[PDB]
Amino acid sequence: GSIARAGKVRNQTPKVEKQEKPKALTGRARKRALYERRLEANFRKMKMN
RNA sequence: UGGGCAGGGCGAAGCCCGCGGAAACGCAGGUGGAGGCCCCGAGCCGUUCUGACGUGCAAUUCGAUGGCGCGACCUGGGCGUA
RNA sequence: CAAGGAUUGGCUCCGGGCGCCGGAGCUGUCGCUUCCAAGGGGAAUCCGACUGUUUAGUAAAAACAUAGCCUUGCGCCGCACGC
RNA sequence: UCUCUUAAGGUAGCCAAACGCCUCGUCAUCUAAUUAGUGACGCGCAUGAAUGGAGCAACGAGAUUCCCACUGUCCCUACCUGC
RNA sequence: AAGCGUCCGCAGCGACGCCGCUUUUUGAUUCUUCGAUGUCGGCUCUUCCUAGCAUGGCGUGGCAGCGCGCGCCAAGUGUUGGA
RNA sequence: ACCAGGUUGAUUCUGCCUGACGUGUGCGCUAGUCUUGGGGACUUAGCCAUGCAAGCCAGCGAAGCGCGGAGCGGCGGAC
RNA sequence: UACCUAGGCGACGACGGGUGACGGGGGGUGAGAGCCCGGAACCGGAGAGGGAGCCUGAGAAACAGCUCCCACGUCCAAGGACGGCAGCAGGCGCGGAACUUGCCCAAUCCCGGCGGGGGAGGCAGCCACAAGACGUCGCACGGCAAAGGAGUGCGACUGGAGGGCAAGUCUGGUGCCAGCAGCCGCGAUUCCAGCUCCAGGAGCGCACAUGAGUGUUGCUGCAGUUAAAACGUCCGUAGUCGGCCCCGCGCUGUGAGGAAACCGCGGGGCCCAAGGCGGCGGGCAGCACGGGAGCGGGGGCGACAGGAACGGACAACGGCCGCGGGAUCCGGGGGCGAGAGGUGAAAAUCGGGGACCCCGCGGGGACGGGCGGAAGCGAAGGCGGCGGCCGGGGACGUGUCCGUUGAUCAAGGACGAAGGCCGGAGGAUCAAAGAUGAUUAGAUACCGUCGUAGUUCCGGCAGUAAACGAUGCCGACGGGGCGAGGCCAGGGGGCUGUGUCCGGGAGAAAUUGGAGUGUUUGGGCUCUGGGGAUAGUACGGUCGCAAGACAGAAACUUAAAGAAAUUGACGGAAGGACACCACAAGGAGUGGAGUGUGCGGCUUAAUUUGACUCAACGCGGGGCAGCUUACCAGGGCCGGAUGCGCAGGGAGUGGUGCAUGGCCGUUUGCAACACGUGGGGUGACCUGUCUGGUUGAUUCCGACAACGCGUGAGGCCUGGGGUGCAGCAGGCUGUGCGACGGGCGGCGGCAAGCUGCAGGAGGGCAGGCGAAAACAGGUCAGUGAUGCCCUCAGAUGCUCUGGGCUGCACGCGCACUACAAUGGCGCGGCGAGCGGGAGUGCCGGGAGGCGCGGGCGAGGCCGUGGCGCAGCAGGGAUGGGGGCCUGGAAGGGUGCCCUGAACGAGGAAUUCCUAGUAGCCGCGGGUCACCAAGCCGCGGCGAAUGAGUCCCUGUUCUUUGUACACACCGCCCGUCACUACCUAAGAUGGAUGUGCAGGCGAGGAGGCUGGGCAGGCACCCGAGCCUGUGCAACUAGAUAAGGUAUAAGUCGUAACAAGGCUGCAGUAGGUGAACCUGCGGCAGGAUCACUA
Ligand SMILES: [Mg+2]
Ligand SMILES: [Mg+2]
Ligand SMILES: [Mg+2]
Ligand SMILES: [Mg+2]
Ligand SMILES: [Mg+2]
Ligand SMILES: [Mg+2]
Ligand SMILES: [Mg+2]
Ligand SMILES: [Mg+2]
Ligand SMILES: [Mg+2]
Ligand SMILES: [Mg+2]
Ligand SMILES: [Mg+2]
Ligand SMILES: [Mg+2]
Ligand SMILES: [Mg+2]
Ligand SMILES: [Mg+2]
Ligand SMILES: [Mg+2]
Ligand SMILES: [Mg+2]
Ligand SMILES: [Mg+2]
Ligand SMILES: [Mg+2]
Ligand SMILES: [Mg+2]
Ligand SMILES: [Mg+2]
Ligand SMILES: [Mg+2]
Ligand SMILES: [Mg+2]
Ligand SMILES: [Mg+2]
Ligand SMILES: [Mg+2]
Ligand SMILES: [Mg+2]
Ligand SMILES: [Mg+2]
Ligand SMILES: [Mg+2]
Ligand SMILES: [Mg+2]
Ligand SMILES: [Mg+2]
């Protein structure tokens, strides 16, 4: 039965929770909070992550 | 060598005309009247009733039903085959 | 005549291409091929192709015949499409 | 695939068929119910190719089953007429 | 009466064996019939038997009831329509 | 007025698939405010409890106690 | 309705069917042409459960009116009475899918002659359904029919992070599982989470549909040689298209009239915006007016339009008649005398009953060789001896005629190879089927033999081909060259066919005078294609005697299938070249025997383990008594540091060489590899790097769209021989010289070079380094080279002891010693090189021992004595007893005596080798306490034979083929067998819609009447039911056939290479199955090629 493989390998996932939230700014504020990063690298060819 | 065998039905070729077609031809309406065609009359026969009868009308008949009914027929006489 | 349906009398007319055909009207206790005469039909199977033939007197058949198909013999026959 | 054996090993077809013993075969259909009928299936006792096989258009007083309609065949008899 | 039947041989069964009865099966035989006793089934119609299916009365149960089993007496009346 | 990925060892094609965009129908997750619009058309022109949806009047004017409002009459209900 | 005409419509698509179809204003989407949608505001239509009939009224065939029928539903006191929400809310059901049983006539309007009514309608509520704008709690005010909101007024998800596609080769889990992913794809950069990041953002994702993407529907604007696709040919009607000159209609301009919404535009500070509101526009192949051109009508030309005529030619054009040719086969005669036939080889078969062969005669059918070709003709299929008849044909020539008669085609008609079918005739060859003889693993095939249909003719059917130029017809235009057509002209000429070559242009390319004049896209007409598979299959139809033909889907399934070319690889393709992991000519062998050793297997407590074709198997320098040593039985010991029992380091001959480094092997015993620049091609690529010749060599000569370089090869380095000088003492080691293929002869000549001889010590001496690319080669067991995984105290650590690595029914590799007389044994004699350390005296029979201590030499050969063909004095295996050596320890070694095995020349197979070589023969070194039958070296003796060839194996090159690219151990086809899905068939059915026809027939208007509000009668409308039937669409079904997908199992191997029988399609038959066979085609062939 391969459905016996279906649930325990789902249950083989470890559960690592969320961090404490640095409540993320929304809207034009986030569009500025990425635009600060767009000017730090002189534009192109930017490593974003 | 003679003779016998209602009446209908279906509608084959061929033909005529109309329509269609470039042509080949195709439809349609008449005409025609073929066929071991169809229903059947006289007649013939013998399917069924396993009817009647079954010391009978009759040493095989009767009735109804049925089949055939211009034929590969039936029939008188003559003749042949014992 | 696949199956299946409608109609059908009498009378009085009208029309036609007038031995007949079509139509209309009237009429009967709805009834009309009025008696007589006169197919029951459908779906299939088996067998024999068919029409025909047969056990006169228990069998009419699927049997026999048939055309077709085939084989055989025969050039001393009726003459090979022949017997 | 191997092997034995025959003159050759049943081909195309067709079938519990009028040909199947088992057998009222098995499945389907038909029915309330079917040893029947039909359609399938085929290791077919013992189907099969002019000893003709398969095939059903048409035909049939042939053999068989179902349906419709019909009916004294029956339920279940009764009455009438002639002789 | 080995065993089964919750325990329990006999409520009801009952192996292994044994004893009978019947002439409703089929044999066995060949006594009667071959100078013929019409041979299956059905239909029809009457009667008889009981080894009793129903109906009447009972006894028994591992019979609460309902039902079912087992046994007894009794042959009066019954014992169908179909594919 | 646009292409991109995908057949191959690589190539050039044909070729279709897929991505990329709008639209409307439904689903899903999510959601602070306001304005505006839409909403049992698709399947079932399926079935319907209950209430309401088309009434009105000036002619004549009864009961009832001049007021009155019944019925007749009229108009609409076919929009 | 009565009577009478025979009409009416249709490929300009009638009629019938379908529609999950109300139409339109419009909407969506695209640059546009278009495509798609319009339930939905407004307009028109239609309906009120299905129907039908009607009353009233101006208006209804009304339905929140009536009458009846039908289907559902309700109440009843059982007599009867009712219900039609496709009105508004609301409920149920349906489904993916859609709101409150709220308030009110305040606004918009309607009915009513006003006070009234209005679920029309508005307001609010519900809903992220949509558009727009903007962020990350309670008074007063305000508005409101009323309330609430607006307006003052105070106190962050959604999806993703491999590519397309923006953003992670971070962390943990998962290990082809789970899962993810539109496509490609991943199995940890793709799963599941965390983080971070990206995208859009109060929104976002998904599914479905549609548009664009798409010039993949092509009017604009495709494609049809080979990718899917020109119908076999010709005729042919509608249709569509169509020469020149010389009032009507098309077309077109403006204008009318045409609803708003909408849309386009324009304003317009609703706070902005979407808006509101106001301007202006568009729409229509209808109408009116205008229009210089175009078309008709009618004449005139007579078209490098056509038809007709004529002329001389030309013609494998057809039909028929006649003549003829030789060959195959048969009959018959004569000769001959043993075979013949047939094959890769044979067999079957016929042969003294005279075959075969030779010669004559005869009969019969079929067939035209050579000439015969990129030559002719025909519309295609097709047409080939000769003569004649009848008929036809195109081209040419022409002041001949006609004058637009034309082009192309649905429908229709005719012809149409082979095979097939029918009837008749005939039957020589060949030959499906069938039968045999072989081949083969099998062989139903290929090969041999035989043989029926058939092949042949006549009359008909059939109507198909790779019917191909895989290329429709007509027409205009477009480069040269060479040809072997026909006619004409006479002036390397013109017409018309026909090939070919080179360019242009085109094309994805191969290629191509059309496949050109194509995004600068438009000549006409017809047909076809729209990813693959299903499938040219099914159903229906038409045709056919049948075979089948024509025509022609879908369900399900799939991300590729395909084209042309490039580079490889491969080929039972051709041609080369080369080699003792080749062969010939040879030599010695191996495999046989015993032993030594290695491998497997088995056993075992363990018999550690790597490696298994060359490139595993005396290999791991692997000759193991301990150690080595990884294994087994035990015992010790903790190199378990370090950071506050845990963390973590460290260790491991534990695992993984498919995680690696390094090294080594193999391709190699090769000759290949690459760059710079330029050229060819759209490109991958090619040239350079080569036709040929040459070389061990891609070494060079040479021609060359290449030119120059670079690795490798060579040069080189070491040893070897000859001697010049120098130095010094089994003579030693420095420095040079010496050979280069130089000279000569002959081939080849820009030659490179090859080959013989002379000269010479020497004319390919032996090694060394050794390119690029690979391989899942080997090594984690060389490593203080190592990632990762596992183990770490009862250890997979280290160490000790014992055992094993040495076990043994057996299979195998490599060697050793032999089988003897070319020998063996016993003495005497002569005796090497590498290596240069070792000898000596004494004891002992030997092995060995002891003490000093600068210090070595073999088998053999020669001479000679014995044995004397014998399992023998060959052989020395096995075993017994004794003596020693090494070591802690003998299974080790050595020595002595004795025992004395197989083996009498070794099956199929198979290795190595060309001169001081093979072989024989020892010696020394590595390993080593002890030990070599091994390895690496060394010398002694010393051949045979080729001076080659690709036969066999391989490698390599050229050309070619390829459906291979994991690269032939590849790819691939079909049956069988299992499961799943789907479609068609299928006796027997089943249910629904709809239309006809008939039967019965409720009700009802009007008329005629009446117990004059009843009832009756006839007519008319007519539901509803019943029966029969048509059409449309659906479904059950025993059985049975396909298709597709399965995990791929069995059987083969049909195709791809000459795929091992060239392939393919047609047709016919046959076979388990791909398929085989016959006939005729075709090249898409393995041939562009020969009396030139
Ligand atoms: Mg007759
Ligand atoms: Mg008769
Ligand atoms: Mg008679
Ligand atoms: Mg009749
Ligand atoms: Mg009939
Ligand atoms: Mg008969
Ligand atoms: Mg008789
Ligand atoms: Mg016959
Ligand atoms: Mg059979
Ligand atoms: Mg039966
Ligand atoms: Mg019966
Ligand atoms: Mg026979
Ligand atoms: Mg028989
Ligand atoms: Mg008869
Ligand atoms: Mg008697
Ligand atoms: Mg008697
Ligand atoms: Mg509709
Ligand atoms: Mg609409
Ligand atoms: Mg093609
Ligand atoms: Mg002779
Ligand atoms: Mg032919
Ligand atoms: Mg023929
Ligand atoms: Mg014939
Ligand atoms: Mg032959
Ligand atoms: Mg068909
Ligand atoms: Mg190709
Ligand atoms: Mg040890
Ligand atoms: Mg060794
Ligand atoms: Mg082949």
Among all strands, which nt has the closest C1' to A37 (CA)? G197
User: A10 beta carbon < 7 A from strand G?
Assistant: yes
Non-local CB neighbours of A46 within 8 Å, separated by 6+ positions: A38
> What tokens appear for A49 in the block?
């992550």
Q: Is the CB of A4 under 7 A from strand G?
A: no
The experimental technique behind this entry is cryo-EM
Please give the Cα distance from A9 to A7 (Å, whole number).
Answer: 6
Which of the nucleotides lies closest to A21 (Cα–C1')?
G195
Resolution in A: 2.9
Give yes or no for CB of A6 within 7 Å of strand G: yes
Tell me how far apart the alpha carbons of residues A16 and A18 are, in angstroms, rounded to a whole number. 7
A47 conformational bin, left if phi > 0, alpha if psi -120 to 50, beta if neither: beta
